[PDB]
């Protein structure tokens, strides 16, 4: 059917610069293993096409879908050697199968080196040398390692990075200005990637409704003075935005997100007085500001929630005749009254309210049956608090490195079939929850911890879905979204797993470790700890500290200030004996 060219429409809407960045992230996320040169080629072809179509919408290919265009550019690049498999695989398909094929190949942990950070002088020099190649490489490296990174926010990070560089690269000492600041930016962007990967998994694995309910809760806490209608409209629009982003339709995602920020800012009077801060800012800063805005204050003088949800004669009628409208109003009313609760807790409270209606509205006297419903939330609210206190005390007491080691041991004993790199990455990230949340006062501490654990446990679920080995992980991952944390927390040691019979011997890498920073060295020690627990799951915590001690020792030894060939292979069978000494 006759239409306005989609590529020209999106090119026109977002401008060349964001179009180029969004297209580079598109390619880098679909073909994570192809070199930068290849992607650069592709992005230039797409950008020449878009400019051709903007000039004359009738030009060849201008009427095609964005999927057709990305697909044909990909398939027609002979360069794509197929030394990288599956390029032909998906190119065999017609649309829409082709695009689905490219999409099903996104790898949540592609086989790549940690993103090595050059020294500050080099970094500053490359930036000065050529900004476009510098930021091209940056978007490519971050997108291909995080193939569901929320695309407009990745653009925003690139701008933030550029500001840090501009400020630090003139300084007397570049490194010391730069390093804390790149570090803080990296942590915020990792949290962003983890938050977005949970939105995408909620949509993909549990359906649009799972994310709509999550967004309803969060937005009702952020904008509690807004009416239900406006909140619902925002949720609707944000749902479309994240579905498009999570499915690789990034130009549409970015366009639609900008339109949503424009909308919210034009209606800021009836949403939040806090929006004024954001609404004066330029495009990416404006949306980023809105994305994480602090909660507005609760409106004074709202009725008791039991009026509408317990005492109304029509509770059953509304639940039966308009369930999503009634339960969504419940989530809105209850959430706007409780900014201090975690989203996941509010969703679990919504689920328990629903289950009580399902049961009670089927009886002879439903009010009698659900009268105590809102009271019956207290035990769900209170449930975490003792184990949270004890885990924050553990953290307070142990410090980061030992808290991570405690959790590594705990989670390896729970789900010991999980791959060692996954258990290490997961436990380290659980340890960051300690660090980020325990230092808040308790009223802030319980909501911080609950929602961060949901983002880390989702990382576990998605990594396990790639290499699936543990029935228990499958079960907790697939049974729910909102009970994942109680589900994992409830697991004791798996007394059923068969210990690994290990001569862990020659699991030493020719002293490779020494170009590695203290950080990676810690990861290595933590990897050995996981391996110790899988070999001896009934070992004492003290035995583990010790057999790890003998690891640290043998590390420094062959890795000293002198050069010798193969010190490790005489010492592998003999650490094997020293670990047979402490562990049996
Ligand atoms: O599954 C998610 C689960 C955790 O929550 C279960 C239930 C309690 O909440 C589902 C429902 C309330 O979501 C409404 C949304 C889909 O529509 C917005 C609005 C009402 O439509 C107008
Ligand atoms: O670990 C538990 O079972 C208690 C609990 C409940 C809710 C949220 C978090 C936690 N624990 C917890 C805390 Cl409080 C901080 C860092 C890492 C972990 Cl696993
Ligand atoms: O694991 C715990 O519950 C804390 C605890 C208490 C006493 C001794 C060791 C540990 N944890 C622990 C472990 Cl299990 C391995 C390496 C390093 C440390 Cl601090
Ligand atoms: Na797509």
Numbering used by the authors: 1 to 584
Tell me what the authors wrote about this structure, in their words.
Serum albumin (SA) is the most significant transport protein of vertebrates; it constitutes up to 60% of all plasma proteins. SA consists of three loose domains, that are almost structurally identical and mostly helical. The whole structure is maintained by 17 disulfide bridges, which ensure durability of the overall protein fold and simultaneously allow its flexibility. In this paper, we present crystal structures of three animal serum albumin complexes: ovine, caprine, and leporine, with diclofenac, a popular non-steroidal anti-inflammatory drug that is used in therapy of chronic and acute pain.
